[PDB]
């Protein structure tokens, strides 16, 4: 119950609420449409979470998306999903969080003009490398630091909501009235609505990470639906109230013109205490990066337990018992990604691929329902949830493909390049002795350099 509700609230709330409001509103065209898109996401997440809970209690294996799909579709689909998660989802999320941290730190120095790009990128890399070193040094430090960052982010959200309520009680709700709420400065099309939903779904990303710890959950059958029902509506309410506070504190046009909505809020409302918030926001971004790294490691381990990834990525330090190669690979991939795109293009990439993976998993749930009707399932969901989610997912995917072909095409191409690697590596079991020698040499080099051994 409350044991896991805390983790469900913790993994969902990262930094998206400090990025999405500018992206959503620009595409929503009005306060009402944006505040509706938020609640829409708050229900699409709930449906997917319920279906994921059903899948998790159906198959006791742990690993989440990687474990379920491999059970239902086979090795190829599982490897493709692992490839997409390793290359695109996690590194892009980390890059977005780091860029957000740099933007929020540099905004007070340049309040009316954009900060230099080189300084922002260098600062983001500095933060990312410091957190990678912290995660490589020890684990208890990382745990305590993550708890402190969670405290910081909850404090920031509570302060924003409280100031918004105080302003509401003072009689300042000009934008929320129907006369101003539905003042459309641009006719919203269907494709623009799809892009707005892609931007607004980043704030809810990370809700399926609970499925990575299902084996560690005590009595999942009863607590899991209760946890979902307690968590998802509360998160939706918190996000909607934060958006309401943002809109009551500043005008939509001036909100769109700021690179840090929260910073403008703090500048105009907190006055002298403004400096309190951008620090308290920054901690939140920290609490993202660290946490994501943890999940990355707990994926790579699994990626080697099924024989899909090289064993060198699953080894731990001899003394400190930390997964150094996984963190190094994650840092390298994120640093490579950060040089190329902008924050919102990366958000579009990660949201598109996240929804593709969710749809594939739900279709796998339906196929499992068809193929194994005698399987003992502790909880059974109605077909309405999977069919509605599948229809919504299909419409969103076609509309986003039409709206922005380039980024979705690049993502699909990157996913498709994973098939030949799988066929050459795992399907092909007649590797020449040269390949075996190269693999053994690289594993020995990694073991000697990083001082790591296979977990016992």
């Amino acid at each position: 119950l409350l044991s896991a509700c805390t983790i469900i609230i913790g993994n969902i709330i990262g930094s998206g609420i400090f990025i999405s409001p500018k992206g959503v509103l620009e595409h929503s065209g009005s306060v009402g449409l944006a505040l509706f898109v938020w609640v829409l996401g708050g229900g699409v997440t709930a449906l997917g979470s319920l279906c994921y809970a059903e899948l998790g209690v159906a198959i006791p294996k742990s690993g989440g998306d990687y474990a379920y799909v491999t059970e239902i579709f086979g090795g190829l689909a599982g490897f493709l999903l692992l490839w997409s998660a390793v290359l695109i989802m996690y590194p892009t999320s980390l890059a977005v969080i780091s860029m957000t941290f740099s933007n929020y730190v540099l905004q007070p120095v340049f309040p009316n003009c954009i900060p230099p790009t080189t300084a922002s990128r260098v600062l983001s890399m500095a933060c990312l490398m410091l957190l990678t070193w912290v995660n490589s040094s020890s684990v208890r430090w990382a745990t305590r630091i993550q708890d402190m960052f969670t405290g910081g982010k909850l404090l920031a959200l509570s302060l924003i909501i409280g100031v918004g309520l105080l302003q509401i009680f003072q009689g300042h709700f000009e934008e929320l009235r129907p006369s101003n709420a539905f003042a459309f400065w641009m006719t919203p099309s269907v494709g623009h609505l799809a892009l707005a939903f892609l931007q607004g779904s980043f704030a809810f990303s990370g809700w399926n990470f609970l499925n990575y710890v299902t084996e560690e959950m005590v009595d999942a059958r009863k607590n899991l639906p209760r946890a979902i029902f307690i968590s998802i509506p509360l998160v939706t309410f918190v996000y909607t109230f934060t958006n309401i506070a943002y809109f009551t504190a500043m005008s939509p046009q001036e909100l769109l013109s700021s690179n840090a909505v929260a910073v403008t809020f703090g500048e105009k409302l907190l006055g002298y205490f403004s400096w309190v918030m951008p620090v308290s926001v920054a901690l939140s971004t920290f609490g993202g990066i660290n946490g994501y790294l943890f999940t990355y490691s707990r994926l790579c381990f699994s990626g080697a337990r099924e024989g899909h990834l090289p064993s060198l990525l699953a080894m731990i330090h001899v003394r400190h018992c930390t997964p150094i190669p996984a963190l190094l690979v994650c840092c390298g991939a994120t640093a490579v990604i950060m040089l190329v795109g902008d924050t919102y293009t990366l958000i579009n990439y990660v949201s598109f691929i996240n929804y593709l993976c969710y749809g594939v998993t739900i279709l796998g749930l339906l196929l499992l329902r068809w193929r194994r009707p005698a399987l003992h399932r502790p909880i059974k969901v109605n077909l309405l949830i999977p069919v509605a989610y599948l229809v919504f997912w299909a419409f969103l995917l076609v509309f986003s493909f039409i709206s922005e072909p380039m980024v979705c095409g690049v993502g699909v191409i990157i996913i498709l390049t994973g098939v030949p690697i799988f066929f050459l590596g795992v399907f092909w079991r007649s590797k020449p002795k040269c390949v075996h020698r190269l693999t053994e040499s690289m594993t020995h080099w990694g073991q000697e350099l990083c001082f790591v051994v296979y977990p016992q």
């Binding site: 003009c113 230099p116 070193w133 053994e440 051994v453």
Partner: protein
């Protein structure tokens, strides 16, 4: 699988790999510290943001003059209550103020009887004024009261002594700041003697209640030297005058007038209009309106328009309307004196559905002026133009730069843009996005070149380009 054992790794990793690991860790830490030092280095030596100017309310948009309420609504509806219902349309035009009046008591050429402190019952009661002011304040449409002592007579300041008129004016100011008006306007100050002193005192009083109030003065002087006599002592006074009365239909002449007027006063805030109480169409043909509106909306100052100037209302091309206050046309029944003499093409109803109408251009330009920082308070710089062109750049800090090209001639010409007249932070790019043109037949959003661009007769182009 293939891997080294824990004891095997400890045996192998003892002799020399410890030194390599320590060296790599130290190199990583040194690289991180150098990275942070570099970050601080570029942060310190980066260009700094420019400071905002803290604009007033009569700075972010145009004003809308209403000479008489009788012709604004028509017969049977010329009242303050009737005007209260037009606030929706007035906010649709995105104006920032109304020059309303005169509505004070003035029967005929009687100094003692003329009371500036009492509202004429014909135009409504004081309760109607309070309700209108509250409704306009809720909609952010500030109301400025005209205070011409005599508007029904040939003399706007009476033929007798004027010091009692000045006392009445001062009492009117104090009373109407008690009421809550957001400014005042006086007209025909030519006939006023020593008007500089009274103008200074009235600015004094008006600014004495708050810093968010203004005084507007109007005159018919068409020469440059006289205006500086009035502005030599007052520096926050909006002075509308017939400085652009003569047309000339030449871009270079208008450029000379605008540049000389700006340079003579420095760079102070101005007001751009062709008269004090007259429409654009009195001095312009049909084809020049769509260009003059763009020029007025793209110049540094506070544009001042009269009612009917957004639909090109004219009194010289439609019999039955006096030139002082033509009847505003909303539909085909707005002019019943001569039935069938109006078309659903010269009314508000018939132009709110036509993208190519003048009202659409008015609304688009007002929206662009009321939001973009460069048009709000950006620096204005004019460079060399063509045979009959007038081109200028609006640029502020890092925001979007705007270029305006206007052709007052009747013969097609070329761009002929010459550089070396702008600062290094506002150099013209090779290709610039095109916002709008005054005539149909131009593709919007297409990046046009600035070296082979050709001008159609009586055409103006508004273009954008981000910081470069």
């Amino acid at each position: 699988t293939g891997l080294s054992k824990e004891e095997l790794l400890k045996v192998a990793g003892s002799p020399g790999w410890v030194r390599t690991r320590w060296a790599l860790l130290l190199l990583f830490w040194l690289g991180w510290l150098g990275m942070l030092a570099g970050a601080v280095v570029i942060i310190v030596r980066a260009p700094r943001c420019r400071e905002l100017p803290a604009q007033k309310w009569w700075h972010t948009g145009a004003l809308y003059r209403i000479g008489d309420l009788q012709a604004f609504q028509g017969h049977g509806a010329g009242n303050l209550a009737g005007l209260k219902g037009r606030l929706d349309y007035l906010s649709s035009l995105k104006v920032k103020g109304l020059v309303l009046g005169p509505i004070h008591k003035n029967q005929k050429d009687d100094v003692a009887q003329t009371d500036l402190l009492q509202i004429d019952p014909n135009f409504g009661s004081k309760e109607d004024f309070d309700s209108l002011l509250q409704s306009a304040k809720k909609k952010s449409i500030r109301v400025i009261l005209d205070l011409t002592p005599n508007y029904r007579g040939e003399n706007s300041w009476f033929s007798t002594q004027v010091d009692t008129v000045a006392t009445k004016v001062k009492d009117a100011l104090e009373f109407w700041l008690q009421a809550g008006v957001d400014g005042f306007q006086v007209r025909d100050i030519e006939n006023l003697k020593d008007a500089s002193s009274f103008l200074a005192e009235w600015q004094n009083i008006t600014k004495g209640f708050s810093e968010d109030r203004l005084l507007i003065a109007g005159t018919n002087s068409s020469d440059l030297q006289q205006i500086l006599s009035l502005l030599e002592s007052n520096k926050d006074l909006l002075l509308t005058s017939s400085y652009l009365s003569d047309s000339g239909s030449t871009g270079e002449h208008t450029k000379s007038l605008v540049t000389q007027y700006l340079n003579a006063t420095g760079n102070r805030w101005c007001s751009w209009s062709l008269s004090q109480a007259r429409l654009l169409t009195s001095f312009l043909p049909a084809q020049l309106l769509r260009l003059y509106q763009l020029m007025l909306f793209t110049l540094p100052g506070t544009p001042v328009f009269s009612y009917g100037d957004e639909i090109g209302l004219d009194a010289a091309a439609l019999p039955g309307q006096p030139m002082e206050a033509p009847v505003m046309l909303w539909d085909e029944s707005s002019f019943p004196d001569i039935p069938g003499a109006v078309s659903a093409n010269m009314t508000v109803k018939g132009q709110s559905e036509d993208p190519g109408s003048l009202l659409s251009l008015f609304r688009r330009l007002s929206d662009q002026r009321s939001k973009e920082r460069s048009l709000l308070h950006g620096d204005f710089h004019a460079f060399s133009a063509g045979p009959g062109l007038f081109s200028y750049i609006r640029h502020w800090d890092q925001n979007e730069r705007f270029l305006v090209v206007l052709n007052f001639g009747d013969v097609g010409l070329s761009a002929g843009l010459q550089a070396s007249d702008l600062p290094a932070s506002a150099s013209l790019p090779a290709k610039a996005d095109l916002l709008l043109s005054t005539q149909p037949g131009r593709e919007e959003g297409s990046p046009l070149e600035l070296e082979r661009l050709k001008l159609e007769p009586h055409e103006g182009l508004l273009l954008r380009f981000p910081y470069a």
